[model samples]
Target: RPTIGQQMETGDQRFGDLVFRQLAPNVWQHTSYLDMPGFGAVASNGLIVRDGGRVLVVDTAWTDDQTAQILNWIKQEINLPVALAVVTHAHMGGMDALHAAGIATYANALSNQLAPQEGMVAAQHSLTFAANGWVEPATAPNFGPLKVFYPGPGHTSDNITVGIDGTDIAFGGCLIKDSKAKSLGNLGAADTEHYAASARAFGAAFPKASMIVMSHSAPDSRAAITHTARMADKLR
Candidate 1:
């Protein structure tokens, strides 16, 4: 068996434009690339977590078609039922495909409210978090072993991070940037004033997270959290 860091370093399984790579024994990172008018091809990342013979998806690709491909890949490759999906923020996209497939979809209360305004489909379920804290799936059971954390607000007012229960892998969604990112990307929905504080909160919450999976770039270490906070501080 490959080590967790090694898993993130190598292995690339592609399903059309979406790519899947194992980050941990039970966690896979799915990346989808989309074309933007000015930005060229942009990549977004999500997680496919397996536990108790079921799977949970975090975020999705840019389009419903791309998300449909992810569902097919799960059916054919993982061969497990997708029990739940959590959209971290409104801009992450692809909630409609999951809804159409009848998979239970969830998002932070603010995210669900903003999704329709952003022209994306809202998740069926709304999870409300108080301040910046963690929500263990054990309490809800519906979320499986995924631990959802709201670190205040950074990239977006509703962005949340997902950490695997027994692993060091934490999917930061767009709230945390990759190490290579020079600046925080896409501030259209960002909480600029609170960005640094949120980043710091995330770093403090998952001090053991070695592999911080970011949506726009490759997996990075906890240093990425520090880097994001520094960059956000510069905005001050």
Candidate 2:
């Protein structure tokens, strides 16, 4: 009933303090706090998955150094080779370290473009999903069971949700709000008027998602879906 694991601190550091919770046998919820450019100090998370002998990192850390710590933990503790990295949005808070250690990266093409627009270094990746194609709603699974789709421009133009076939978890990125969030945290590029509609559509689409992970708070169930929708509705 408590989601799938226990929370454990991954030690504290100056750049950021990291904490991880085991979501399953081979997956972890990695959380970190950092002093962001416009948002001040905030907490964010990414999904770390181990499949076979390789590891996949969804939403890298806030800085290259933070990412190094994550990799060190994975190497020494999780004991797997990090193979790929994925980004959930164009925001620097979620993508500051994309492709940090030369790992292959998969990102929304628009996210890649907006990274530099926001002044963060663009991740050099081997693949990119078409911006418009990703937001097509119908073109959800442009890459295997791991699909990235626009829930409609709530967080940003390129903000998208990610889901895997067997993981039973859907990452809502910055598009979805956390339970305790009073309002949308950052509106620098948010579509406040349509935020609720986008979140609602995403909720309806993934009714079976057992776990929902957002960018800046604790993971929750379908409740987070409705919570986000209601919050967005009231924010306007």
Candidate 3:
């Protein structure tokens, strides 16, 4: 529990000044996307995954150069473009790097994708880049009617979670926001109520998920979700 705490510390916008890890083949992540409360030291996470026999980069872009590293490493290893990218809850650096990514982009079904983009443009945004980017959320990763519950909400509205069938991997997005975020980070204009609810929803949604993933920290066992839910339940 504590090791992760150290990784969540964002300094110099360095995303914890920590080296990133490859949790799985074509799957990489950086920790410490946290802002401990009174400073401009929060780093939202970026995630990369393997899907459809292609490397899918999710939520790619934050303070540190992890995104660039991820992009490079993918080419170094797989030597292919990120096939289908998903905006795992738009924030500061949401859609910028994606231009080079050269993949199809998408968001949650109900995502107000423009909020983050416009918010950043208006200087009203504090967390990420331009905000919900140019792409419309007309068709996105869908789970019934809402984007909040299917996976779980952590980073922002339209935070999407995906359980890779045939694989034990599950993308929790900000569903498990980590203790670092709760202590220091601000909601990037996300719906707080959805965050807590999705934690529970994810618990039920992926009961057998061996690896619960996110843009931060490492992939934890499904117990990670259960334990996270318990932590949230305590507040209720």
Candidate 4:
């Protein structure tokens, strides 16, 4: 239909291409509109990570519409299966989009705890469903559709890193990111030890990754994950 830039200039400030950004070769970013009056702006990003054969869509853009726009982009740019899906922490956008696609999911086993909580922070942010809550997985979360992983807690006590083994591409979701040179904002709330420990757990879980992709700015390196650990360490 409308070009991405045109869409951004149209009647969709809440959405539009303004909320979109390219993270990596096959990765993308979408800012959640959670700060509007009577609304919220989670400002979270999602990644459509791609391996050689399979594509893993991590987190859902912002909402179903935003997620749809993102998926459309994937169809144009990445052109992969989105065989796997995962949520970084407890964000309604992530879960809602996944459920919409009816794709498999992965996340920290404890994420359910965070997903159903209230927003701990309320600066200029306003998420309709705080604590990043959205999407209600069927029956037991451990359903085969998703091979969820529980790598401890960081950013949120229930955050997890989703992976696509075939491509060595792991979507850190909100769980990890690059150094300040990459992104000025970092999600650090969990205990330093816990966050660092969980981040390290992420490394241990997926060390073979050659190119690291988070939902933020650029491709990540071990340094990014370490920085996340360091920030978690400095948290009060």
Model 3 CA deviation exceeding 4 Å by range: 1-20, 30-44, 51-53, 63-66, 92-94, 112-149, 152-155, 178-195, 234-236
Residue 177 lDDT in model 2?
72
Superpose all Cα atoms of candidate 2 onto the true structure and report the RMSD in Å to 1 decimal. 5.4
- Number of backbone collisions per candidate: 0, 0, 14, 10
Indicate the residue-level lDDT of 80 in model 3: 62
Q: Number of the top candidate by lDDT?
A: 1
Ranking by lDDT: 1, 2, 4, 3
The TM-score of predicted model 3 comes to: 0.64
The deviation in Å at residue 101 for candidate 4 is 4.1
Runs off by more than 4 Å, candidate 1? 1-10, 136-140
Estimated TM-score per prediction? Answer: 0.91, 0.80, 0.64, 0.60
Where is the poorest 10-residue window by lDDT in model 2? 1-10
- State the lDDT of candidate 2 residue by residue for 4-33, as single tens digits: 123334432222256677776777777766
Candidate number with the higher TM-score (1 or 4): 1
Question: Which ranges in model 4 have alpha carbons more than 4 Å from their true place?
Answer: 1-44, 49-55, 76-84, 104-109, 118-149, 181-189
Poorly placed runs, candidate 2 (over 4 Å): 1-16, 36-41, 92-100, 125-145
Q: Which scores better on lDDT, 2 or 4?
A: 2
Instruction: Tell me the TM-score of model 1.
Output: 0.91
RMSD for each of the candidates: 4.5, 5.4, 8.0, 8.9
